[PDB]
């Protein structure tokens, strides 16, 4: 696409500059261009791709919720039209991310750290599509569940319970259960088991790894506090 003529290394450098400048749409476009070079992504590059799109979709989700709330209260065509405009843009970003994962990040990801990372992203972006779905909603939910489940299976076999990627996956899958799948009990069980198994493995970690794992464990605790 529009990044076809730029060097892969220059696209990564510019994605890091865009992050510093809080220019997340540019950051996402640079990372999309880097993925389209066809080479696999390093751990840092995967995180740049995920941070970029998370920030872009985050702004769209926050705007969609404000508009949906105004629309719900109002129930002319303007509020619905504008909510639809934002919704279509959000769907477009999710479709772009899912397209990058399917062409061909997941199929080339053999290591647990990369494969779980991508399958979790696949689960997350189908979850963002499910948040706005009313039509296909069931099928979108199934696609999110399937991706999260494959990621969970690999993570339980290949990573320790304190693995930051494994923890973040479990955190997100528990939120999918709570408010997308209408399975609050599954959500609470998953968050509790994940927290308890990580706590039991903290003794194996260095000071820095302990900081990384406990930060995510606190998010599981925050959710459990709100849910129980």
């Amino acid at each position: 696409g529009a990044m076809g003529s730029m060097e892969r290394a220059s696209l990564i450098q510019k994605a890091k500059l865009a992050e510093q400048a809080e220019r997340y749409e540019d950051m996402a476009a640079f990372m999309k261009g880097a993925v389209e070079k066809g080479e696999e992504l390093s751990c840092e590059e995967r995180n740049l791709l995920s941070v970029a799109y998370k920030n872009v979709v985050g702004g769209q989700r926050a705007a969609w919720r404000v508009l949906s709330s105004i629309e719900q209260k109002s129930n002319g065509p303007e509020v619905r039209e504008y909510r639809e405009k934002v919704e279509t843009e959000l769907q477009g970003v999710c479709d772009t991310v899912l397209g990058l994962l399917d062409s061909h990040l997941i199929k080339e990801a053999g290591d647990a750290e990369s494969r779980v990372f991508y399958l979790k992203m696949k689960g997350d972006y189908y979850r963002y599509l499910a948040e706005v779905a009313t039509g296909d909603k069931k099928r979108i939910i199934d696609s999110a569940r399937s991706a999260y489940q494959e990621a969970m299976d690999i993570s339980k076999k290949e990573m320790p319970p304190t693995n930051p990627i494994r923890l973040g996956l479990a955190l997100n899958f528990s939120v999918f259960h709570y408010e997308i799948a209408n399975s609050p009990e599954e959500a609470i069980s998953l968050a509790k088991t994940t927290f308890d198994e990580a706590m039991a493995d903290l003794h194996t970690l260095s000071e820095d790894s302990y900081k990384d794992s406990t930060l995510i464990m606190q998010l599981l605790r925050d959710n459990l506090t709100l849910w129980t």
């Binding site: 941070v51 998370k54 973040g168 955190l171 408010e179 995510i216 998010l219 599981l220």
Partner: peptide, 12 residues
Amino acid sequence: KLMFKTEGPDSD
């Protein structure tokens, strides 16, 4: 809407 904690940037 009450948003629960998810991984990464709290961008919404």
